[PDB]
Structures are given as structure tokens and as C-alpha cells.
Amino acid sequence: PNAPACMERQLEAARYRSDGALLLGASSLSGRCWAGSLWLFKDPCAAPNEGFCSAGVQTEAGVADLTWVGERGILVASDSGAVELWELDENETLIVSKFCKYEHDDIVSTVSVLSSGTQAVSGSKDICIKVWDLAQQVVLSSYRAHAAQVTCVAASPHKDSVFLSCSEDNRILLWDTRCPKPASQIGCSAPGYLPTSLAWHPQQSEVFVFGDENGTVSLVDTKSCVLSSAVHSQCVTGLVFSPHSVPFLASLSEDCSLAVLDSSLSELFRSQAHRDFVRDATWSPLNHSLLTTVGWDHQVVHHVVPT
Amino acid sequence: RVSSGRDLNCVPEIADTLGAVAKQGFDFLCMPVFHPRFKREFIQEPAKNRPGPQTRSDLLLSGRDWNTLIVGKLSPWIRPDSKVEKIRRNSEAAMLQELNFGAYLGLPAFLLPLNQEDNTNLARVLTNHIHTGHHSSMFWMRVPLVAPEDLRDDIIENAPTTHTEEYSGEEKTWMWWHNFRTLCDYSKRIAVALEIGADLPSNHVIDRWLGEPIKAAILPTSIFLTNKKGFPVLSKMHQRLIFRLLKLEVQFIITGTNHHSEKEFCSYLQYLEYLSQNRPPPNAYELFAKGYEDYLQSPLQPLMDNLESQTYEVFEKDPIKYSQYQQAIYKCLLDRVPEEEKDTNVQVLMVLGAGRGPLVNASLRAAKQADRRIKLYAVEKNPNAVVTLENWQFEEWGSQVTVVSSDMREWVAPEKADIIVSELLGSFADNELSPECLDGAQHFLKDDGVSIPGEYTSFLAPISSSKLYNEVRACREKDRDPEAQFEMPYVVRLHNFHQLSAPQPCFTFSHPNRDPMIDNNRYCTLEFPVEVNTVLHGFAGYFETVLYQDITLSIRPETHSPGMFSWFPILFPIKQPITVREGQTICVRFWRCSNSKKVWYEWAVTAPVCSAIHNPTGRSYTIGL
Ligand SMILES: Nc1ccc2ccc(CNC(=O)c3ccc4c(c3)c3c(n4CCO)CCCC3)cc2n1
Ligand SMILES: CSC[C@H]1O[C@@H](n2cnc3c(N)ncnc32)[C@H](O)[C@@H]1O
């Protein structure tokens, strides 16, 4: 239905909107043609069957990441070095290209948006970090704080001038766009290994978590003494908090298993449903016990966590 | 013209990409073999059993394209020198897979990055690859001029950049390269590519990159300035660097995205061609020497071996030399015979080492210009030269020229002469045994006579070049001492090298030598300061000569004759490279030794470190009498 006949083999991303609909990202990482696609489903259990998609389009390059902008925009991090914006039409049938700019000199590795709804940031393998104006389709500023591939950025849910970043130089920065020296180094009570992912605590504006290359995660207080626990046999590569009054932390890793942790980092739930690297996970807003995962084994898995 | 290529990290379809690259005028494309984000697990279950093709097939391009138009790249996630054991194991496996695939495809070159000090495992894997099986691919290392940590901005409140001068900070990248190549034993299959940023080093450590196997340069689009018409241009300092690079014929690669999309990406090539087409043209010396850069040849030894006609043909194609000889003769004749005795006085000149007689003709011309009467004796030993002289005598010169076939040291001249003219200098002035020949042929000079040349000297200076070091290493022979290749001089057009210091004089001779017990043996000590942390690979020399009071020839770079080109510098290598620290000096000793049958040189470095004597007794290299 105005969509390509076949979905690419590797699924790399998945996110939900408040109405329960989900967006998948996919790409071909092997074979003759190296490019991806964007797909929309209104029936989560029908995924990844193309025949039941509501919408979808092909892209000119692979998709590194993607997020939601308000209800209709899709912000995409492309392999081409591009930053691009797509928009859902009135009938949620076609996905329309709004713009495409080429501001990075290498693959865009991460993208996120800020709480103001008009700002966004991106990172790339090129060490440069950029700040975007989503309304004007321009770059507002750029910084070169890191001397290594950027691996993760995240926006604070509470402040529209604030974000976190890290790269393979073992440095973690906190940013404030209102300062003459926008970055501040967090430092670390347990240095020596490279961090792999970052996430903000949903309720506490001064609390965040991160994971590293050894499969260990840590909970830290921005103002200062840390809490940590080993979980995975391999690099963490991904963290997300559940939509609860008492949040739970989902943790992915390269060991292909999935885990859900308590606030104490105690393990509550574990799964080995996947047969390949797991790439992402998201919570369904309409069902607080339900966690949905995506990965390179082309499976869509619905887990119920005994919360 | 200037060869170039494009660097891409995103190639959705190779057929179209390659087409577009060619459309814009590029000669080649650098690109990954495997999608760069497609990490492949080894060892660990179940990931290692992931099904499916791992990359695109090779049936998409013809064999001709694979081995001509494509340069490979290592995937960015591979890190053999990481600290976590698990990563290291996957990284080594991944590296071998990619190298073997590139070998399968026949790619002419592949790129590997260097971005830190410890690259020990990277080197280990690569050398095992190099020595296994049979492959011809070239490996280029990508090294920035300035380490990225020093290019960061200062926007971190509690993490300021260094704002002082840490001298060694300007040398980090060179060191990384240096250590890598020694780990890999200077393999000839390993070379470099340099990445140029906006911030350039001082003139030093620019110069230190010369004498290095640079094959390519990488220029991001990010370092172009925009001119008044909106086109990318270079700063003056960047232009100076490009002009220097053009002399080594390195290839240029353009990377990054299009920051001037409104002007068409190909405009970057147009600018580069503009600069190369406005470089100044080469002079005759350079044109003459084209094709011999850093090419080694054994020196000639005419006293012992008879030269063939073609050698002579070449020696004669350099008119500046003969003009200088003619002037020397002209003045000498005028200075000996006054006008009043002109028609009653005949001078006798002898040419020793007449060859095909270009000096005979020069001598006759000088005499004509000077309006002075002369008689000539041409003496040569080479019978294959004597034969041409016979014809010259008969057909044109007439009775005024006598031709003698003999060894000048044995021949008894019937008459004494007052002017002796010779062309016995070699590339290092005395390595042709010219003083022995002339001392012998001294007894027939009139006591008030003159030698042309009357004086000659020689110079030495320390040099560095890793390329030359390998060219020498390569010149091995069977049933010969394996090191006897570092104990003999070479004739070479030195090009890709760095000079460490000013030349200094070493050995000097003059004629006629009236001293009793002259002794042609020599000993000399030289010492040179060093202002760069570099590596010494050998010494090179030059010479100067005085044909007459105010007439000289020279090949010292500083006083080099204006268009003289038949001569090349002499190279004297040492067995082991020596690292020299700034502020130290290099002390070198030379000897000129002889016996009744042979002449040979011996040499050694005594400081900053000591080295072995090279060529003791003439065991590896001799000059025959
Ligand atoms: N008494 C004189 C007079 C003139 C001179 C001019 C220059 C020099 C220095 N050059 C050398 O020793 C030298 C070595 C290898 C060479 C040649 C030259 C040439 C050839 N090869 C390769 C092997 O055959 C190939 C054919 C053309 C020339 C010495 C002189 N000594
Ligand atoms: C101008 S090329 C050098 C010339 O020196 C000549 N030559 C070298 N040694 C002698 C010698 N001992 N007697 C005569 N000619 C010599 C060689 O034959 C050659 O022609």
C-alpha cells in the first residue's frame, strides 16, 4: 500500500507514540543494496509483516537512528551524513520528505530532541557535535569538545538547554547552552572503561545512568559515590526507563539477552528470545507491563514483565 | 596531471557511485568493503552463527575495476589494541577477514588508521598477513599532522586546553609513525598518507616528513576558504605545502561533505589543478634527471675498466663544463706568453685521459682565441677510444695533434710540457684515483708549469631517508657477505630526503705536488650540530674544483654550477639507523687508505653513539689501480 514490497533484513529501531502506534526503522547491512526504510504500524502485533503496515517509505541511505517530533515528525539520523525530516500526512498514509541537509562529514550516529520541541542535537563519527533548529532547518551552533567518535547523546526531559554526551575518549560531558563554556566534565568514580550509552532519570532532574563496554551499569548523582552492578557479559549498548511512578530500567547488550532491573539494579526479569544482536527496546504507553524489542534477527518480540 | 580520488563512507550502490565519481573527474574511490556498522561476532554463541552473506559480491565489477579503481578501508569498529580481551579477540579476527578479502579482490591499496601511541597488536596482525601467502597489495597508514586532542576547542569549564608550549606535543604524530614502522621492519609495502588540517606546524616537523614514504595526502573540504566569488581556495601557507607535495607526485584524496554545494563538488578539483598548472617549470637539470629519482647506481672505475662509447656520448652532453675549461686554458696561455714573443713561442699542452677528444677541440679553440701557438699531445689508454682519435687526427686536426696510446703513468714523453689538462674527477673528486695518475704524470711537467685543475676538494653532510635505507637493503646478492651492501658507495640522484646540516670540507688535493714523500693517504674528523629530533641514515657528499684562478665548477647545493648536470652526489650509508636528539652533535670519521694494488675508504660514526667500521681493508669495496 504505497510502500515497498520488502522490508530489509535488519531491524534497528523502534518507538511508540501515546496512541499505541509504533514506528520501526530498518536497513540492509549486507547484500547488493545498502539503504533502509521507515515503517508505521497501528497494530503492534502485526509487525514486521509488511502486508499489515499502515505506511512506509524507502530511504536513500541506511538509518542509524530516528525519533519522534511531536506527533507527526520523524527525525532521522542517516549514514549519508544527512540530517533529515519526514512528516506524516493527514491520512497517516504517506510519509512526506520535508527537508534534507548534509551537515556532517561522516555517519550521523545519534539524534535526539529537546523538551522545548524546537531544538535538536546530533552526533557523528566525526568528532563534531551540532545543535539544530527544527523550525528553520538550520544549524545554530557546533562544538568540538570530544576527540573521538561520539557514541551517545541525550536530552534532559526537564531543561531545554541541557544535554549529555560521551565518546570514545572516556570523557562524559554535561552541556548547558546558556554558558560561555557550555560543557562541564562529570568525571567518574569508576574510570578506566569506555561508556557505551546514556539515559536521564525520568523524575529526578539531577540523576542519570550510563552503561559501559564491560556489561556494567551505573547510577550516578550529577552533583557528586556511585551505585553499580554488573549485568551483561558484553557491552551494554542501550538503556531505557519504563513509564511508571516507580521506574524500572531496561537493559540491552551485545550478548543478545535482555534484562529488566529494579532501582537497586537488582535483576527482576531476564529473556533470551533473540538470536542476534538486539538493537533497541521501548515501552508501550498503553500497557505498563509490556516491553517491545527489535533487532538483527528480524524478530519482533513482545515481552510481559512480571512487575 | 595530478591524480586524485574521492573518499566516501556511504555507498548505497557501487555502480552508480563509481559512475558519479568518474563523472566528476576522479581517478579512484576509497570505500569500505563491509558496511561499516555491521559488526561481526566471532567465538561467542549464537552470534557467530549468524546466517547470510556478509557483504556484497564481487561479480558486480569487472576484474579490471577491482584492481584499478578501488582502495579499501578497515571498518572503524575494529580496535586490536583495546584493553578488554573480548574486544581484542574479535578485533583480530575482523582485521584478518577484511585483509584477506581485499587480497582476494586484488585491491591495489588498503587504508589503516593510526590515532594513538600503542599500536602493537595492529602491527602484529599486519605483519603476519604480509608474510603469509603471496600478495601485492600496498598498505597505507593514515596519520594526522596534529593529534586530535590538541585540536579540540576550549569550551569545557573544568578541562582547559594546554595553553603553554609543550615542545614534544608537536612531534607526537611523527613518533607514532616511527614506532609502527620499526615494529614492521620497514617493509616496503607499508607507506603513509597524511591528513592535513587547518592548523599547520611550524616549518619544522614539515621538513621531517620528507624522506618519508608519502604516497598520498588527504584534504578535507573543511579547510577551504571561500573567496569573493564563492569558490573554495587555499590559504597561502596551504598553497606552499601543496607545491612542495607536488614534487613527490603524491596522490590527492578529497574527503568530507560538500560545504559549497551551490558550486558543484568537482570545483575542488578544479582549484587543485589550477595550482599545479601555475607551478614554475623545471630547469634543464631537473628535466635531465627525470626518471632517476632515488635510483642507485654503482660508480664507474675508468682506470680499470674500459668505458664503452655510450658512456662517453653522455659525458659530452653538458656544454657548460667545456666552456669553463676553455676559459681556463685561454687565460692560462695569455698569462704565460706576452704579445712580444707571440709568434716565436710555442707552448706545449698535454691532455691526459683524452677520451674521444672533446678537450682537444676545446684546447684548440682556446688557442685560437688567445692567438697563441701550441702543440698538443693526446694520451689515452682505452684502445676503443684511441681508434676514434686516429680518425680525428687524420681527417681534421692534422699534424698539430699527436696521438699516443698508453698508460700515462708508464709512458715516456719525448718532451716536457708546461700545461697539463685533465678530466679525472669523479663524483667525490678523488675516487677516480686522480692524484695517483697525476703524480705519476708529474715528471714530464716543466718545473714552472701548471696543472688544470690545480685544486680540488670534497664535502660531506649527514642525511636522512628511510626510502633510501630500503633501497640499499634490497641490494643483496647470493654467495656474498649479506651486509656487504652497506659498505660501498652509490651514485644517486637524491630527491626524497632530508638534510640534517650544512656540508663541511673533508679531503683536499692540489697539483703539482712538490713535497717530498707526499703521501696520498688521509684522515679527517668532522662534526655537525643537530636542531631536529631525527634519524641518521647515511652521509652524502659533493665536490668543488678550481680550473684556474677565478674559474670553478661545483655541485655543492649552495654553489652549484648554473646548469651543470652530468654529475650526481655520492651516498655513503651506515648499517644501523641512529637516533639523534636535538642539541647533540654528530661526529664522523673518514679514512683514505691504500696499498700497492688498491685504494679504499673506511668510515664510522663515533658520536652520539658509536657504530662499526664500514668497509675495513676494502673487503667490500675497492678501487683498483
Ligand atoms: N672522469 C670522469 C669524467 C666525467 C664524469 C661524469 C660523471 C661521473 C659520476 N657518474 C658515475 O660514476 C656513473 C655511474 C653509473 C652510470 C653512469 C655514471 C652512466 C651510466 N651508469 C650506469 C652503469 O653503466 C649509464 C650510461 C650513461 C652514464 C664521473 C665522471 N668521471
Ligand atoms: C674524460 S673520461 C676519463 C678518461 O680518463 C682516461 N684515463 C683514465 N686513466 C688513464 C690513464 N692511466 N692513462 C690514460 N688515460 C686514462 C679514460 O680512458 C677516459 O678516457
XYZ file of N, CA and C and ligand atoms in Angstrom, chain B residues 301-307 311-312 315 321-322 351-359 379-383 385 404 406-410 422-425 432-433 437, ligand 2:
140
model
N 84.598 2.995 -12.749
C 86.042 3.000 -12.465
C 86.901 2.902 -13.723
N 87.016 3.968 -14.525
C 87.648 4.035 -15.826
C 89.117 3.688 -15.836
N 89.778 3.759 -14.694
C 91.175 3.423 -14.731
C 91.313 1.952 -15.023
N 90.393 1.168 -14.488
C 90.451 -0.259 -14.615
C 89.642 -0.782 -15.775
N 88.427 -0.292 -15.920
C 87.559 -0.789 -16.968
C 87.499 0.135 -18.156
N 87.519 -0.406 -19.354
C 87.351 0.470 -20.490
C 85.904 0.802 -20.656
N 85.623 2.072 -20.782
C 84.273 2.518 -20.983
C 83.866 2.351 -22.420
N 78.890 5.743 -22.894
C 79.155 6.488 -21.695
C 79.759 7.793 -22.094
N 80.665 7.730 -23.051
C 81.320 8.946 -23.483
C 80.314 9.891 -24.103
N 78.728 11.773 -21.364
C 79.584 12.711 -20.666
C 79.724 13.999 -21.413
N 80.516 22.635 -18.968
C 81.788 22.202 -18.474
C 82.881 22.571 -19.413
N 82.640 22.358 -20.676
C 83.688 22.585 -21.614
C 83.955 24.036 -21.770
N 96.999 16.494 -22.927
C 95.704 16.103 -22.434
C 95.764 14.678 -21.985
N 95.579 14.479 -20.708
C 95.687 13.143 -20.177
C 94.308 12.616 -19.920
N 93.960 11.524 -20.583
C 92.613 10.983 -20.484
C 91.783 11.651 -21.558
N 92.347 11.675 -22.745
C 91.744 12.318 -23.887
C 90.364 11.794 -24.254
N 90.061 10.525 -24.037
C 88.746 10.047 -24.399
C 88.490 10.182 -25.884
N 87.390 10.833 -26.249
C 87.057 10.983 -27.660
C 87.507 12.333 -28.167
N 88.229 13.030 -27.311
C 88.842 14.320 -27.538
C 88.028 15.615 -27.471
N 86.980 15.761 -26.663
C 86.248 16.998 -26.587
C 87.133 18.098 -26.012
N 88.161 17.702 -25.261
C 89.058 18.666 -24.688
C 90.076 19.081 -25.690
N 96.785 11.792 -24.863
C 97.170 10.494 -24.375
C 95.963 9.773 -23.826
N 95.771 8.551 -24.290
C 94.665 7.715 -23.826
C 95.077 6.259 -23.805
N 94.539 5.483 -22.868
C 94.855 4.064 -22.785
C 93.798 3.205 -23.425
N 92.564 3.663 -23.382
C 91.462 2.864 -23.866
C 91.549 2.724 -25.367
N 91.854 1.560 -25.921
C 92.088 1.373 -27.323
C 90.844 1.618 -28.130
N 88.989 4.034 -27.727
C 88.889 5.458 -27.806
C 89.992 5.918 -28.721
N 98.819 9.408 -28.738
C 99.595 8.393 -28.060
C 98.746 7.370 -27.355
N 98.742 4.780 -24.632
C 99.500 4.295 -23.484
C 98.877 4.643 -22.140
N 99.468 4.101 -21.097
C 99.143 4.412 -19.715
C 99.960 5.629 -19.337
N 99.319 6.703 -18.938
C 100.053 7.930 -18.663
C 101.113 7.768 -17.579
N 100.993 6.753 -16.738
C 101.956 6.551 -15.676
C 103.210 5.839 -16.151
N 103.138 5.215 -17.318
C 104.245 4.437 -17.858
C 104.914 5.094 -19.046
N 93.423 17.866 -17.490
C 92.783 16.580 -17.317
C 91.364 16.691 -16.826
N 90.621 15.617 -17.021
C 89.249 15.496 -16.592
C 89.080 14.199 -15.855
N 89.717 14.109 -14.714
C 89.727 12.879 -13.965
C 88.893 12.924 -12.729
N 88.103 13.951 -12.538
C 87.364 13.975 -11.298
C 86.191 13.070 -11.411
N 88.446 8.577 -8.216
C 88.870 8.096 -9.503
C 90.336 7.849 -9.523
N 90.989 8.039 -8.384
C 92.425 7.900 -8.310
C 93.114 8.943 -9.142
N 97.250 9.216 -10.631
C 97.541 9.323 -12.025
C 98.378 10.536 -12.308
C 87.255 12.004 -19.827
S 86.730 10.346 -19.441
C 88.122 9.830 -18.419
C 89.273 9.392 -19.289
O 90.379 9.064 -18.485
C 91.091 8.094 -19.199
N 92.102 7.534 -18.366
C 91.953 7.056 -17.039
N 93.115 6.602 -16.536
C 94.030 6.796 -17.568
C 95.387 6.517 -17.632
N 96.035 5.973 -16.603
N 96.096 6.801 -18.774
C 95.373 7.356 -19.788
N 94.066 7.680 -19.865
C 93.429 7.369 -18.701
C 89.990 7.087 -19.549
O 90.408 6.261 -20.543
C 88.930 8.076 -20.041
O 89.093 8.282 -21.385
